[PDB]
Amino acid sequence: SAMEDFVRQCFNPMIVELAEKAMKKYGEDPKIETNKFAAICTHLEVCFMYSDGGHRFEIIEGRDRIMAWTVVNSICNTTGVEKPKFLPDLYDYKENRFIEIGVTRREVHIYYLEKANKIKSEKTHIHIFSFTGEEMATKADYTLDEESRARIKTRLFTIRQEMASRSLWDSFRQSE
Ligand SMILES: [Mn+2]
Ligand SMILES: [Mn+2]
């Protein structure tokens, strides 16, 4: 498949290996769920760029569940922040809050409403990125500076356009 080829060419080997183990754990093959493969890789990469945009951020995403819940619990015991019911993506030590990162092929406000209805904790901050340079965040507080968010949005647009040059974007956007 071309989608798997694109994933292995454009994403860093570490991100690809993380996405593959995350899928293989639940019985999913990246050679069939190729759009899900690309989506996991893209989300992981966004989380890592977000965390490097500051150290200000703790990466929860990408860790095995044991190590991730260990990190979340250590944060909760040293800070007193309430424990999330779902594993979030990052922790902001400056704002002292968990962040849930979303990357959507659809409208930012659709996905934002979906995520907010999912987590149901006003504590966890929501930040949604689109592939069109659009973004939506809790209380319109975008946490990061304009340069870091422009970095993320450029990378997302580039993934979309490299998918389009391979005639893969149409499959990808109708797959969420
Ligand atoms: Mn996550
Ligand atoms: Mn997420």
Author numbering: -1 to 52, 74 to 195
Give passages from the manuscript.
In addition to the co-crystal structures, the apo structures of WT, I38T, and E23K PAN endonuclease were determined. In all apo structures, the active site metal cations Mn2+ are coordinated by His41, Glu80, Asp108, Glu 119, and Ile120 and a total of five water molecules, producing an octahedral coordination geometry at each metal center. When the apo structure of E23K is compared with that of WT, the terminus of α2, where the E23K mutation is located, is distorted. In WT PAN, Glu23 forms hydrogen bonds with Arg84, stabilizing the terminus of α2 which promotes the correct position of Tyr24 for base stacking. In the E23K structure, the change in charge that accompanies the change from a glutamate to a lysine results in a loss of hydrogen bonding with Arg84 and no stabilization. Lys23, Tyr24, and Arg84 become more flexible, causing disorder of α2. Unlike the BXA binding to I38T, no rotamer changes were found when comparing the BXA bound and unbound in the E23K structure. E23K disrupts the end terminus of α2 and allows Y24 to extend further into the active site, disrupting important hydrogen-bonding, pi–cation, and base stacking interactions made by inhibitors or natural substrates such as RNA. The E23K and A36 V structures are the first reported structural data for these mutants and may aid in studies to develop a structure–activity relationship (SAR) for these variants.
